[PDB]
Design a protein around this ligand. Structure first.
Ligand SMILES: Cc1ncc(C[n+]2c([C@@H](O)CCC(=O)O)sc(CCOP(=O)(O)OP(=O)(O)O)c2C)c(N)n1
Ligand SMILES: Cc1ncc(C[n+]2c([C@@H](O)CCC(=O)O)sc(CCOP(=O)(O)OP(=O)(O)O)c2C)c(N)n1
Ligand SMILES: [Ca+2]
Ligand SMILES: [Ca+2]
Ligand SMILES: [Mg+2]
Ligand SMILES: [Mg+2]
Lengths: 813, 817
């Protein structure tokens, strides 16, 4: 049974060989490491010695291969065939080219640590092989004739990446020389040995490690949709490649990594596979891997989506470049993620004042005996007889010339619009709900919704749900790309949207708004409706949609929270990208966040989108924040946002029970002959027979509580009280608010009325701002709200009801 | 050619057999059992077994109602342990065990019927189509009691929670439906489980949680670890039993989409966070509200994230309660043997719509047409027992009588329910903590850069000029000496981010760790104090780490628990824990926590992600008695703040905005007397008025501030000899120290103008809340209060250190202009 022992041995190398591969350039773990002439049958008859030597070189040399966890047998076979073959040794030209990339990379590092103070944390020393590795990824993408490689990375080696991968000149990199470590960049990569070129860009990011991961994916997907490539394209090339860099401690500890990997094969989020590179320097500031992860590898999270993982020795730039090229080939064949775990080291301390032997003495005693990756490769090429002593001297002169070039170039640098639509547009969107495909079976409970929409489009009484689809549908008809997504967003959390309808017999999906992408003459408008149900993620989903608006500034991008209360799971994206990206990096986004909000007795996690937090984050021109009370005002808000020619995030506090409130409906004329109104008066004063001069008490409010206040006003016939709505919370509509209040000359008292606790809602900012920006109108402004609470509401629906009545009685008391 | 094909086939069943297992009770995928020589079946292969016998063992173990994933496990002993228990002829359960399982399905299903009939608006909580989770959870707990363990702590979302309370926790209906009501779906509970066939009992508890699915996952881990440390079991125990078991329930869409799941799994084998393995149960009803699995995950299984830590995964058919109970018992046995997580993927269905107003055939017509033909799990099991001849017709009839009796009991019981302190230490304490830094173990080699820190600490302890970093260790060390358990953790927290702490020192030659404060756990006479110092470097996580420390403070209310952010700027990665547990858990659930968050804060030119812990956000979250929020300016006041927090006998979170450059500021040092003869000061005056020769009556301009900007304001006042300006510090930001604030400002009668001074932008720091609150709570003192700060910004600061420097000077010039 000698042949049986061979089969088990072959399986052992393929499954576990990576545990014995020489991947660590520091060799920190000591414990880590005759039928030979008899011919055995293999899938071919070869000697056991030749079977074993192919398996040791393939799996136990400088590359640890993990692929037997992949469920697809064709993917396992593809890797097996490319890994278990005698590889063609690289040509002297390729070896010299790798060496030139190592020279440029280390001369950049030497210059950085010598020329400037405070640059130790950014050092790529001990990890310079990432430069020829990233070069091989991009060169291989250009070999496949792809259009672009978009990079996302943390700060380590970023300016080196700018100079030696993006190809930015020193004059631009060191111009007015820390924000440079967070800025976006764009360039063109020209193949050294090939005849192709490819676009290379780097995205902007905060210091929050891994938070840019879903942003990168969103941005790339936006670029893929524009190029008609990938999931929403005519071709299956996915010609825009995400190249995502990571650190070993951050890759294992940050939850956003798993959420972003979870998007990789989703119809709404896939980008045809991401190339991941982990700069595994086997440390996280002062922290050893045993305190940073509970798994053998920092890349083990990527096993979640059956991605192949390649652990590679960073002191072998040839194996690193070969693995990079294999990764691109796998991504092209299976449109799925590949992870490259580059084992390397951090030569110097984490930052100034870090003596790394204080916390890691054993590691740093080994590192202190380490010659650079460039010097090691130069000496290895001599040993193998690949390059002559003269060639190695020319290589050192190239190093010096590159070191001099950067010093000399930086030295010279130091020396020197209506939103209204026509009735026919409303009618076309209405009729689109009944223009079903041949033989389509509508669910019996969905059919009245489609009939009511055709009725509303011709007769009025348009509800919130339809007004939103009227805004999006008219934008699609004008040629705009509309991307809408979130948890159960196709149907709607409150069963109100039905943007996608499902055939009761076949399960086939029909999207009524997609018919507006075609003009009445049959020609395309250039518009699209891309609507998806998201994964149960907030961080990665909000990240993605923010990224998508950056990737396509001409798109209308909306993310919807199930309830506004769950958006705090995406706080890092709100804080680091959405509210602040423009001021910090000049990076613009027109992303829309829809946050269902309102006190209805559903508890502290189904009541508030935390208005007070978005209002606190706001500064002049950073975001638009609104809480519309009418369907038409919401329609005009969305149309203004998509057509204003301005890239600024919009935060909308959307209704729940108010979706079905019969008083919260709009007339055809409000869509065809009106505009967005930042401040709304009661219709009895603007259209009715109400007398503004009789008003002595003015109630200022926003949202659904208006209807309750107006119902109470009508019941008691209170002509002395007027209700004014602030529809646009930020920026404050100072002019409209001044002109509106001036029309009520006999007002003796003013109250800001809100459902939210005293420390929440708009009061903390309005109570401070309104008396300041409008002292003649808001001096003496008082608050009517729920009491200050440590949670957004009471957990009891009975307590909610008493508090709601208490607000209305106080307002009319 | 024959024996080799068998070995490959054995490997194929072990590796991929789970892809062909009959695990889905709905059988939605038709192609599932179609995309996976006859003379060799009778030939024996080398133990020597016939190929037909090898194939029968493989098919029964890997292709029936249990899908086993385990060959991804790197440890070969763990793979062999599973193989041996799965590839054997299992003992058929006794009729008593089968009847006991059936009685748990009767109870589970009678509770579901009652819930949907008695009350309105309970559809969203329906466990219907997933009732087998109750005999499965029962088998987990019973198996933990069989191992003689102390407690099982459960964390779960809302689906089937009250059923779990009644049939697992054993809470009576009188308590469950008392004044029914939605808050009951988020409350903690405790009970005792008594073995049906065994002689042991075990404690069973359920922890509180928000609606935020999976956010409780790290909280559960923290809580269990605190309970294990108290029981001297596990990682910080004399025994390696880990006698407190985390039982974590999940939904299939949430388990795959929430990042906190992966961060919590990442903690499972860490010395500072391990709990000896968690038993995970995913209630995989193959839907997430209206969303199909193909839009919720990019992997074959919702549980594929657990492959990250090489956890064994069992996919089990929820219509086979015998396989479900067997797998639950095997999971407990594996967790006991290897102290690692086990994940049980229970495939089931959601019988009704997601909530009121959901007609599930609108979005999932194919799935709901199949579900509409499904008989309950109880009825299916009752009929299967008849078919196998396990129970008689009379036995199936008494089973149906038991269901009716249980349905009547809950209706009848609910019907009957409706009818009815000094912080000052002695100088010897300071000296002991100082000397402890030099009381090195025999032959210990101190790193040459760490030795001056040890010597300076012995010097400071005896001579004064105590800096912030030593004051913090003086507060923690004195608490340990008094018998308190101190747990301190965060990113690079052993050494400290600013190389200031050195709570753990590393031997330059051997790498061995020495903890100077741990010497204070032993009295000078050699007896233990009862105290302990648990200090760790955390994983590079905020959400799971903050979650863990909050849960740890709940698990042991007598512990001093502190979590440190690398920089306050990264705590927004844990916003869900701050919002849902820390700031609000007491008001929502009556759940108390004394957790401390240390947030390094201060404008120093390091950018918008290395400047602010967002004071304005914690101040906004605050409501009377929910949290204590402070920004101390002196080492002694920080020492007294921590000691008051650990000794006040009150369970309330403390948020501390801690220094960075001010750690090394020579003016920010304290005298021995500040520690030995003082207390925490919520409001601080300039020493020239309290100890010096300054005249308070000369002051016409009063500057109110907090934090390090005080030193810059005081340095400017000294330079220009500004006797007309006084600087008052608000050390305790929340609750506002109204009485101390008023009494302090009354001592400056000639003040004509008052300014709140801060480094933070106008829309940040304490101004948005103080600017609104101070003129209201103290109208005679703060009417006309003006702000001096940075301009309002969309980020916490400028990205440029040059812009920062101009703005910093602009604040100081405005304050003295
Ligand atoms: C989400 C979040 N939370 C924490 C941090 C803090 N933080 C950093 C700075 O910001 C601070 C300190 C410094 O450099 O001065 S660097 C760092 C360690 C990174 O380890 P890694 O992934 O192995 O990488 P490598 O450094 O290439 O070895 C952390 C943990 C962060 N930025 N984002
Ligand atoms: C982190 C976060 N983000 C979103 C939500 C919202 N949300 C829920 C309610 O809260 C809301 C609607 C409802 O029930 O009325 S339930 C739910 C779907 C759950 O799918 P699952 O895991 O497969 O489970 P199952 O329901 O047992 O099948 C979501 C996505 C949340 N709670 N937490
Ligand atoms: Ca816009
Ligand atoms: Ca306390
Ligand atoms: Mg690292
Ligand atoms: Mg589900």
């Amino acid at each position: 049974d000698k042949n049986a022992r061979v089969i088990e041995l072959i399986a052992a190398y393929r499954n576990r060989g990576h545990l014995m591969a020489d991947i660590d350039p520091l060799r920190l773990d000591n414990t880590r490491f005759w039928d030979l002439d008899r011919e055995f049958k293999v899938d071919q008859r070869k000697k056991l010695r030749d079977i074993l030597s192919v398996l040791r070189d393939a799996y136990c040399r400088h590359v640890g291969v993990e692929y037997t966890h992949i469920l697809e047998p064709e993917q396992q076979r593809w890797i097996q065939e490319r890994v278990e073959t005698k590889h063609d040794k690289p040509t002297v030209a390729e070896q010299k080219y790798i060496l030139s990339k190592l020279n440029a990379a280390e001369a950049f590092e030497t210059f950085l640590q010598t020329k400037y103070v405070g640059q130790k944390r950014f050092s790529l020393e001990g990890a310079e092989t990432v430069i020829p590795m990233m070069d091989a990824v991009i060169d291989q993408c250009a070999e496949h004739g792809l259009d672009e490689v978009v990079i996302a990375m943390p700060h380590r080696g970023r300016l080196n990446v700018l100079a030696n991968i993006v190809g930015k000149p020193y004059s631009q990199i060191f111009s007015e020389f820390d924000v440079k470590y967070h800025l976006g960049a764009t360039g063109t990569y020209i193949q050294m040995f090939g005849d192709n070129d490819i676009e290379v860009s780097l995205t902007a990011n905060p210091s929050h490690l891994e938070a840019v991961d879903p942003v990168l994916e969103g941005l790339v997907r936006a670029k893929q949709d524009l190029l008609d490539t990938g999931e929403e394209g005519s071709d299956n090339r996915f010609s825009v490649v995400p190249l995502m860099l990571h650190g070993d401690a951050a890759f294992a500890g940050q939850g956003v990594v798993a959420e972003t990997l979870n998007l990789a094969l989703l119809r709404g989020y896939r980008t045809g596979g991401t190339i991941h590179i982990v700069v595994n320097n086997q440390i996280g500031f002062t922290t050893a891997p045993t305190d940073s992860r509970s798994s053998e590898y920092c890349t083990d999270v990527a096993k979640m989506i059956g991605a192949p993982i390649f652990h590679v020795n960073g002191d072998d730039p040839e194996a690193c470049a070969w693995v990079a090229r294999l990764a691109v080939d796998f991504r092209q064949a299976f449109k799925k993620d590949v992870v490259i775990d580059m084992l390397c080291y951090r030569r110097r301390g984490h930052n100034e004042g870090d003596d790394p032997s204080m916390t890691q003495p054993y590691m740093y005693d080994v590192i202190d005996t380490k010659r650079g990756s460039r010097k090691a490769y130069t000496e290895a090429l001599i040993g193998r007889g690949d390059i002559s002593m003269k060639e190695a001297e020319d290589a050192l002169r190239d190093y010096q010339g590159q070191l001099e070039r950067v010093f000399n170039e930086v030295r010279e640098l130091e020396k020197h619009l209506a939103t209204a639509v026509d009735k026919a547009m409303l009618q076309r969107i209405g009729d689109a709900h009944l223009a079903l495909p041949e033989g389509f079976t509508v669910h019996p409970r969905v059919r009245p919704v489609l009939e009511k929409r055709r009725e509303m489009a011709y007769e009025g009484r348009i509800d919130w749900a339809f007004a939103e689809l009227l805004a999006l549908g008219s934008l699609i008809a004008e040629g705009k790309l509309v991307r809408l997504s979130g948890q159960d967003t196709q149907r709607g959390t409150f069963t109100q949207r039905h943007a996608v309808i499902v055939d009761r017999k076949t399960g086939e999906e029909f999207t009524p708004l997609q018919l507006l992408a075609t003009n009445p003459d049959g020609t395309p408008t250039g518009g699209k409706f891309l609507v998806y149900n998201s994964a149960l993620s907030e961080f990665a989903a909000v990240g993605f949609e923010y990224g998508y608006s950056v990737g396509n500034p001409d798109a209308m991008v909306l993310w919807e929270a199930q309830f506004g209360d769950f958006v705090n799971g995406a706080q890092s994206i709100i804080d680091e990208f959405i509210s602040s990206g423009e001021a910090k990096w000049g990076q613009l986004s027109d992303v829309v966040l829809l946050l269902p909000h309102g006190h209805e007795g559903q508890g502290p996690d189904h009541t508030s989108g935390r208005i007070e937090r978005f209002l606190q984050l706001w500064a002049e021109g950073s975001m638009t924040i609104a809480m519309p009370s009418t369907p038409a005002n919401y329609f005009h808000l969305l149309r203004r946002h998509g057509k204003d020619g301005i890239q600024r995030p919009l935060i909308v506090f959307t209704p729940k029970s108010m979706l079905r409130n019969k008083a919260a409906v709009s007339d055809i004329r409000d869509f065809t002959e009106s505009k967005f109104r930042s401040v709304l008066e009661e219709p009895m004063y603007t259209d009715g027979e109400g007398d503004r001069n009789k008003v002595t008490r003015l109630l200022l409010t926003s949202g659904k509580i208006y209807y309750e206040l107006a119902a109470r006003k009508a019941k008691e016939n209170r002509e002395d009280v007027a209700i004014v709505r602030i529809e646009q919370l930020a920026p404050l509509p100072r002019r409209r608010l001044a002109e509106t209040l001036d029309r009520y000359p006999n007002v003796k008292e003013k109250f800001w009325v809100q459902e939210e606790p005293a420390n929440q809602g708009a009061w903390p900012s309005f109570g401070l701002t309104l008396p300041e920006i409008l002292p003649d109108h808001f001096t003496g402004l008082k608050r009517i709200s729920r009491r200050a609470m440590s949670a957004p509401s009471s957990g009891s629906s009975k307590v909610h009801a008493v508090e709601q009545q208490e607000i209305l009685d106080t307002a009319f008391g």
